[PDB]
Amino acid sequence: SPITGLVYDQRMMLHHNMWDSHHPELPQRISRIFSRHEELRLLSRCHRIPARLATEEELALCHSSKHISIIKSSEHMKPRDLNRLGDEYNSIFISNESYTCALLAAGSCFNSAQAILTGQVRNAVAIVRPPGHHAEKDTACGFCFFNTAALTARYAQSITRESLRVLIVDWDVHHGNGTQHIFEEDDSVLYISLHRYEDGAFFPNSEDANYDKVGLGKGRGYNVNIPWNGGKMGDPEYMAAFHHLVMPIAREFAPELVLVSAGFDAARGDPLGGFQVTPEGYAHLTHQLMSLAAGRVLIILEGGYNLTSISESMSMCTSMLLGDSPPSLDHLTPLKTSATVSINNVLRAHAPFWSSLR
Ligand SMILES: CCCCC(=O)N(CCCC)Cc1ccc(C(=O)NO)cc1
Ligand SMILES: [K+]
Ligand SMILES: [K+]
Ligand SMILES: [Zn+2]
Structure with a gap:
């Protein structure tokens, strides 16, 4: 009988915005998701995995010493220095606890x-x-300090073998620019992201997220961007992208571990997404991914800012992991x-690399 793990530690709530207590990347995101897991009796069904801090050596799997050092130093900064440092990045706020919280997020995933x-x-x-997926080797970005998902792929390889095949599926509504760049030349880590794009008119605002960025060097073919150019994308579009692109390429890659950069900001009612993927939609995506890698799937919260939407949607993913039947969609x-x-654009761009694409 398969066991589903769950990791949650309330200490990660301590990271906060000292200048706007209503900033959407709220401490209560994770406490609301946790409370819904309790209410739905999902938590009791899971094996509770402890949180830990990532070590500096583990952060070096993906991040420069200079980047680790500056974020580490924030732990001891006065408020005015915390405000100045955060303003040096694109969309970052920092409190004295932010470094520790980012370490706990990564160590929990390890x-x-x-x-x-x-x-x-x-x-x-x-x-x-x-969250993690906007973090680059050398910089914090978009509410993210260290790239939790990228680090976890590298940590996984570190405790198994260097060539362990890892699939990262990033269904947060934004492009994980950091994950793409870290593995852009790497054919051991297949990165597939779906994201609102709008010709670069959506954060993180770069043409790196378009469908023609297919990877570099021996990494060519191992970066799959599925960019959306409208709005009000929802279950039909995500189901179709999985049917035609994500699952065929994943099966051909044959990953041994699946990591999900599972932002829930493509869910209904999210001002940072504008999409309408339903909890049932997320369930179906999770269940499709469980068909891979002998079920070795880890679901990692990224973004998602409507407290009710992320709590219902992430709970439905846990329900799928636990073996519950996928809901009617x-x-x-x-x-x-x-x-x-x-x-169609992604299929044409990736036809050279994936023989099973049609
Ligand atoms: C201000 C420009 C319009 C909004 C914007 O672009 N923002 C919001 C800034 C504060 C809300 C940066 C941002 C947005 C989403 C994510 C995320 O959810 N990533 O997964 C990360 C960073
Ligand atoms: K994404
Ligand atoms: K890659
Ligand atoms: Zn996001």
Whole structure:
């Protein structure tokens, strides 16, 4: 009988915005998600995995010493220096606890990946903040200090073998620019992101997120960007992108571990997303991914800012991991026109690299 792991530690709530207590990357994101897991009796069904701090050596798997040093130094900064330092980055706020919280998010994911790979659990869910996928080797960005998901891929390889095949599926509504760049030349880590794009008119505002960035060097083919160019994208479009692109390429890659950069800011009612993926939609995406890697799937919270939407949606993913039957989902609504164009563009760009694409 498969076991699902869950990691959550309330200390990650201590990271906060000292100048706008209502900033959407709120401490209560993770406490609300946790409370919903309790209310729905999902937590009791999971094997509880402890949180830990990542070490500086583990952060060096993906991040420069200079970047680690500056964020580490924030732990001891006065408020005015914390405000100045955060303003040096694109969309970062920093408190004295931010470094420790970012370490806890990553270490929680390391312990979860270790639990999966050593067979203590089949799959796992990590209710963590601050998020990770915008963080670059050398810089913080977009509410993210260290790239939790990228680090976890490298940590996984470190405790198994260097060539362990890791799939990172990033379904946060924004492009994980950091994850793409860290693995852009790497054919051991397949990065697939779906994201609102709008010709660069959506954070992180760069053409790096377009469908024609397919990877570099021996990494060519191992970066798959599925960019959306409309709005009100929802279950039909995400289901179709998984059917035509994500699952065929993932099967051809044959990952041994699946990490999900699981932002829930493509969910209904999110001012930072504008999309309408339903909890049932997220369930179906999770369940499709469980078909890979002998079920070795780790779900990692990234963004997502409507407290009710992220709590319902992430709980539905945990329900899928636990083996519950996927809910009824509509399969008949026609796609938005732009979404057919996006999927077609990615298929044409990735035809050279993935023989099973049609
Ligand atoms: C101000 C420009 C319009 C909004 C914007 O671009 N912002 C918001 C700044 C504060 C809300 C930066 C941002 C947005 C989303 C994420 C995220 O959710 N990533 O996964 C990260 C960073
Ligand atoms: K994404
Ligand atoms: K890659
Ligand atoms: Zn996001």
